[PDB]
Each structure stands twice: as C-alpha cells, then as structure tokens.
C-alpha cells in the first residue's frame, strides 16, 4: 500500500491527485491517503476528510483551525491528528507512516515543505517548477545530505522524460544528482510546448496583447500565473532550467519544440540517437499518478489514446523574436550561479504586472532582461542553511529590482 | 567486450550489423566479432575476415571450403578456426567465447541455427519474423527448457516496443515467455506501418495492381518478398502474430496503425494508459544495434532526429476491405494452434505467384483464405522434436495446398 500525503489538496495538482487516487483505488486498493494539508479552504478539507479519512489533517490558516476540529466531529468513527501551520506541516513530514508527499503548493511554502520532505528522507512528488529553478543548488545539496530522499518530477514534460528512461538505470541514480544523464545514456532533450495562446500572432499583434487575451487558452484551463507564462513562453524557459537541474542535461542539449496538439509530452534522445517519447491526451493525472507509482505502474480507467482519431501531430521551432523570454531563460541558465533565481523572481513580478494590466507584453522580457543585466554573481555558500538564506536574499532583491524598474518607467 | 557472431553475414541484416559494429567500434572498442557464417559468398567472407579478424569462420557450402582456407592465408597475423556446413555452425554455437548471435538467415537454416543458439543458452538477435510466426510454439518450448537463452527482437517495430520498456521489469522475464506483458505492465500495442504503396487506391484500382507497381516502395528499398508483403499489408499481419508471441499480448490488444512518415516505429500503452514510443529516421542500424547492446546503449554518430524538420506525423486506420491479408492474420492468430504456420506457408506461395505475375492482388488473400479454411487444428506435440516435425509437415502441406489451389484455378 502506498502511503501518501497531499500538500495543497484543494489546488489544481492536489485535486487531480485525489481524483486519480480515488479512481485507481476503485480498481484496486493501492493508496492510503495519510495526510491532507490545505491553506484556508476548511469546508473543502472537511469534505475531503470525509471521503479519504486521513490520519493527519493540517490547515495553514490558524483562524479556521478551531472550525476544522468542530467540522470533523461530524465524521463517524474518525479521530485524526488535527494540526495547523508550518509546524503541522513539519509534523506530517516527520511521520513514519508516510512514504510519499505530493507538493502542490507554490512559492515559499512550496520550497519550505519540499525542504522538510527531503530532510525526512521522503519521496517527494514535486509539481512546483519555480522551486527547482530558483533553489536548484540548495535542493541538490540537501539531496546529497539526505541520501534516501528522492524528487520525482510531476511537471508533465519532466514526467514524460522520466517515463522514457530505463528504470534499471534510473534506480542507480536520482533526479538532481550529478551524472544523471550519463548514467541514463541521455544525449539530448526535446521539450514539447503547446506554444500558448499567442503562438501565431505577428510582432504587431504581440505589442498590443493583454492578459485578458491570454486568459483564454487553446487547450487547457489553468491558474493565471502559468497561463501568462505559457503565453510568453517563459513557462518553457523555466522548464528548460528545470530540465537542466533535474536530469543534468547541458543547455545546448535541450531543444524547445512547439507541438500544438499536446499529445507527445516530451522526448529523449539517447547516445545511440534512438529517441523515446511519452504520449497521452492533455491530462495531469498521468504525471501525478506516475510520481506516486514509480517505479511501478498501476491500472487506471482513463480513456485510451486514439491515435487514428488524433490523426496528425505537428512540430516547429519557436521564434525567439516573438518569445524573447525563452532566450533570456537559456542565457540565465548558461550563465549559471544564481541567475536562474533572478530570472524566476523578476518574472514573478513582470508576469503579475502584465496580468494586472500595468505593463505590455514586450515590457515583460525588457524588465527581466534589465534585472538579469543588473545582477552580479556571488560566491555560492557551502553551508546549506547559509545557501538557503542567500537564495532568499537574491530572490527578494530581484523582485524589488523589477518593481523599481517598473516604477521608473512608471 | 561484446562477443558476437553474425550468421548470414553477407545478407542485408548481416551487412547492416557489420556496418554499425564498425562505426561504433571507431568510437569505442565495444564489439569483438568472433564468428562469421555465410552460405556461398566466399570472396565477401574473405573481405570481412580481413577487416574483422574473427576467431571462427564458417562457410556453409562445402564446395568452397578449400577456396576459403586458401584465401585467408593472405591475411598476415591471423589463425582462425575455419569450419563449414551445419557442423561448423553448431561448433560456433557451442563456443564459450560467444555471447550473442545475429540470425540474418531466412526460412529453415534460420530456424535451425536459432535452435542451436538457444540450446547453447545464447542471446539470439532474431530478424526472421517468419520463424516466430511459423514456429512460435517450438521457440517458446525451447526457451522454457533453456533458461538462459534469450531472443531479442530485431524487426524494427518489435525493437521499438522492446526499447519502450523498463529493463528493470524486462530482466524479470524474457521474450516469448508467458506473462511477459503482465510483468511489464503492458496493456496494448500500436504497431506502426508505412502502409506500402497502395493506401489511397480504390478497390477497383487494387484489383489490377501488379508486382511492378508494388516493387516501388514509398520509403525503403528492400527484398522483393517483404516489399510485396508491405504492399498487401501481410507484412503487418505477420508482425501482429510476432507481437503476440514475443510479448504475450492478446490479439484484441494489438492495433495496426498506418504511419506513412515512418518516424514513430511503434508504441506501447501501459496499464495506466500512458503511451511510450520509439522514434528515428527509417534505418535498420538502430534495431540491430540495440539487439546487441541491450540492456545497455552505446554511442553512435548517426544523424540526429530533427523533429522540426520532419514537421508532421500522421496516423490512420488501415482498411481491412482493401488489405484483407491483415484480417486473415488476426483470424489465424486468434484461432491459434498451427493456423499461423498455415498462414505463413500459404502466403509464401501466394506472394511469389503475385511477384511473378501469375495471380492478381485479391487472389493472394483468396488463396490464403482457402488454405486456412482447409486446415484443422491438431493436437500439439509435447515432445520438442515431434513438435518441430509437426511444424515442418504443416508448413509443407500448406504450401502444397496453396499451389494446388493455384493449379486448379489456372
Ligand atoms: C501541463 N504543463 O506541464 C504545463 O506546463 C502547462 C502547459 C500548457 C498546457 C498544455 C496542455 C496540457 C498538456 C499536458 C497536461 C495538461 C495540459 C505549458 P506549455 O506547454 O504552453 O509550455
Ligand atoms: C523496417 N521494417 O521493420 C519493416 O517491416 C519494413 C516496413 C516497410 C519499410 C518502412 C521504412 C523503414 C522503417 C524502419 C526501418 C527501416 C525502414 C514494413 P511496413 O511498415 O510497410 O509494414
Ligand atoms: Ca521507462
Ligand atoms: Mn510543464
Ligand atoms: Mn517490421
């Protein structure tokens, strides 16, 4: 039985995780949902508790802690450990009855819960790409100290890559470990992208696009931040750095390819030049499930891929003139040091400004570029705690710097 | 070092094997070619021996055994064991210095040499799909008795399938074994086909196509027999049965899909519905190489797949009305017993009649159908020697039946 905790259980990743766990458990009882952690949606947490009856419940917002305890009293024959805040999160991570943790939280609390999951030697299904891009150095250091901890990618493209590999070799290494690509015989990565809602706009059309325009995607419904990142292709920029860190693949060996049908989720070229790819309909249940079953697979009742009906798959190179964010991401990764931290942070601000109609499309890449230009590389701290603090400081500096550039151009 | 013997070294598969071995060895000294076995082409064998300097040479045709001994005297620091006929082949199979054997021989010397390779617990890279189709029961029994022997597929689609698997799981079983699909969590197979030269043709056009029409394949210059099979789609029919035997996949779980670009070589749907596929330009060097390196990969200098340049991949269902051979193959496979033997044998005759302009396109499937209609299941011999004779007898009977049908009609 797979004992799992879901962090951010009412968010998109969390709800998809619970959906596929429910459906798979109907086929065969494989999963015990041992813990649920949510921010403030106490009614939904209660509804989830009613169904999954986890040993642990944690709600981040203390102001509804008391409300949750009262709600849970309605549930027959059920006496969970009910917790609150950051320390409830640490307590869940320290439990011996939990093997795997799904991190479906963004920003700080994402990195924070990830850190604690690793320190407790857990298998960590990580869906927060920003944490890998921003804190890749720290995660690598932590995984070197906590040798039985493992990060398993949930981001769809990185799951695809992971699935294309031979588990016989994967089991001799782990994500974020030096030599991962060498041990797995990886030569090159094709990172497939939907291309976003602006993929066929002219330069003139791009100058004027608004977030309202973007918040209508050609394939999926998602959170606002990632939708904007998909529109600028900074999402794929972030995913390039994520690939580099997860799989130890050199930047000149990662190619972004636009695949508008979203059936092939990414491909791996091995040293013999054979290419393996993973395919399915656009659906996050597959990557989430695999992160929890790896290195095995279990049955689902998902709709089988009908290739003949899909009929046609297309691929083209993205225009770096139209999607300059892709270029900035490569430049920042190749530069190394903490440039990815700065890229991530400055993008956070620029994405939000465009979201809220404060700047235009090309101002996004302009602002990020100027912040990157501005940064000066730093000696990387050897101590893991100092390194974490250094990352946070650079992150905060870069957000402030972006904001100041905005305020200059008003 | 990988110690390999090439059986049929001057045929298509044999020459491709030596070419990729040569090229890979330039990059890293990986392979020792320990034995070469050819039928009659004593000059070419001499040329190969000069380059590869194998410990063993065998020529099947005894009449040129002496010419071979004399020719090799021209080679300076070289003292090979020179053999001939079946006994040389057997002596090679029994060598403890030989790990893997590429069987690039057709019909029955192919099967006979496979049998001896298996009896000597070798790894057998098998390219002869007709032997798996016709003698699958026999190979299965022989592999159950000789536990360390393994067949590794070389047929491009079956190699693709094999490459999509986790060797982690593969190493717990082996091809042509009961439960192979269960252990590897396989649900379903997409077997990709070029579709041959006639996919767009009407039924009325198909009535009158000729072998000269068929022998201009849209994608690959190959032997005449397989070219005709690709035209009728009997090639895929045979490969469906090959899939069933190699991977223990039920017939209802094998779908033939027409993929004219011949980039995706086949796909495996796992029990979670995730699909993994193998991709490359049409080239037989990758499947051959993988059969020799499995479960590892080695570097090549093959041209990298350029997906953006490829640009478009298409897929459609084959019409069983237009390609009735596909339907007959499934029917024979589903029927089981020795029906696949009968299918293969009658096709051998029908294919050749069509090739030589003695019958028309739909006469191929008509003759095959009538031979199958005429066969009745037989008790399967328990004894491996009796079983082999049963297969040969049925094969011979089916060829005679097909011939007598043609003769009646003519
Ligand atoms: C899903 N995923 O990993 C993402 O980063 C979101 C996609 C945009 C959604 C594409 C449609 C889709 C594919 C697979 C799974 C769910 C949705 C970003 P991109 O392809 O536009 O770069
Ligand atoms: C190669 N192979 O395994 C074959 O059975 C030959 C192909 C026809 C040639 C397609 C082009 C090709 C693909 C892969 C490797 C070499 C050539 C048969 P089919 O696709 O027409 O059924
Ligand atoms: Ca795999
Ligand atoms: Mn993604
Ligand atoms: Mn084939």
From Swiss-Prot, chains A, B:
The entry's NADP(+)-binding residues are 10-13, 39-41, 130, 223
Q: Where along this sequence does the record place binding of 1-deoxy-D-xylulose 5-phosphate?
A: 129, 156-157, 194, 217, 230, 235-236, 239
Q: Where is the signal peptide?
A: none
Compartments where found? Plastid, Apicoplast
Q: Which GO terms describe its molecular function?
A: 1-deoxy-D-xylulose-5-phosphate reductoisomerase activity; manganese ion binding; NADPH binding
Protein's pathway: Isoprenoid biosynthesis; isopentenyl diphosphate biosynthesis via DXP pathway; isopentenyl diphosphate from 1-deoxy-D-xylulose 5-phosphate: step 1/6
Q: Which reaction does it catalyse?
A: 2-C-methyl-D-erythritol 4-phosphate + NADP(+) = 1-deoxy-D-xylulose 5-phosphate + NADPH + H(+)
A cellular-component GO term for this protein: apicoplast
Q: Which domain of life is it from?
A: Eukaryota
Q: Which EC numbers does the record give?
A: 1.1.1.267
GO terms for biological process, alphabetical: isopentenyl diphosphate biosynthetic process, methylerythritol 4-phosphate pathway involved in terpenoid biosynthetic process
Q: Which cofactor does it need?
A: Mg(2+); Mn(2+)
Q: Where does this protein hold Mn(2+)?
A: 155, 157, 239
Q: Which family does the record claim for this protein?
A: Belongs to the DXR family.
Q: What does this protein do?
A: Catalyzes the NADPH-dependent rearrangement and reduction of 1-deoxy-D-xylulose-5-phosphate (DXP) to 2-C-methyl-D-erythritol 4-phosphate (MEP).
Q: Name the chain's protein.
A: 1-deoxy-D-xylulose 5-phosphate reductoisomerase, apicoplastic
Q: Which source organism?
A: Plasmodium falciparum (isolate 3D7)
Q: Which residues of the full protein are shown?
A: 77 to 486 of 488
């Amino acid at each position: 039985p797979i004992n799992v905790a879901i962090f951010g259980s009412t968010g998109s990743i969390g709800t998809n995780a619970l959906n596929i766990i429910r459906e798979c458990n109907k086929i065969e009882n494989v999963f015990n949902v041992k813990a649920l952690y949510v921010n403030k949606s106490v009614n939904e947490l209660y509804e989830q508790a009613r169904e999954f009856l986890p040993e642990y419940l944690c709600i981040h917002d203390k102001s509804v802690y008391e409300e949750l305890k009262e709600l849970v009293k309605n549930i027959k024959d059920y006496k969970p450990i009910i917790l609150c805040g950051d320390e409830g999160m640490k307590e869940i991570c320290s439990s011996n009855s939990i093997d795997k943790i799904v991190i479906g939280i963004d920003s700080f609390q994402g990195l924070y819960s990830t850190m604690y999951a690793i320190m407790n030697n857990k298998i960590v299904a990580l869906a927060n790409k920003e944490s890998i891009v921003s804190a890749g150095f720290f995660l690598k250091k932590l995984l070197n100290i906590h040798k039985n901890a493992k990060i398993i990618p949930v981001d769809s493209e990185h799951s695809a890559i992971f699935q294309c590999l031979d588990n016989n070799k994967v089991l001799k290494t782990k994500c974020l470990q030096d030599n991962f690509s060498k041990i797995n015989n990886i030569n090159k990565i094709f990172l497939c992208s939907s291309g976003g809602p602006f993929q066929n706009l002219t330069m003139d059309e791009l100058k004027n696009v608004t977030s309202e325009n973007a918040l209508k995607h050609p394939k999926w419904k998602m959170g606002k931040k990632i939708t904007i990142d998909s529109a600028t292709m900074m999402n794929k920029g972030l995913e390039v750095i994520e690939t580099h860190f997860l799989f130890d693949v050199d930047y000149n060996d990662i190619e972004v390819i636009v695949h508008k049908e979203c059936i092939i989720h990414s491909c791996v070229e091995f040293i013999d030049k054979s290419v393996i790819s993973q395919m399915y309909y656009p659906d996050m249940q597959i990557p989430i499930l695999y992160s929890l079953t790896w290195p095995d697979r279990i049955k689902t009742n998902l709709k089988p891929l009908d290739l003949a009906q899909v009929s046609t798959l297309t691929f083209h190179k993205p225009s770096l003139e139209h999607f300059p964010c892709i270029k900035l991401a490569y430049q920042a990764g190749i530069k190394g040091n903490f440039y990815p931290t700065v890229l991530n942070a400055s993008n956070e601000i620029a994405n939000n400004l465009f979201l809220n109609n404060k700047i235009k499309y090309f101002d996004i890449s302009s602002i990020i570029s100027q912040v990157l230009e501005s940064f000066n590389s730093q000696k990387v701290s050897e101590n893991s705690e100092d390194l974490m603090k250094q990352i946070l400081q650079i992150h905060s500096w870069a957000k402030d710097k972006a904001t100041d550039i905005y305020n200059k151009h008003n």
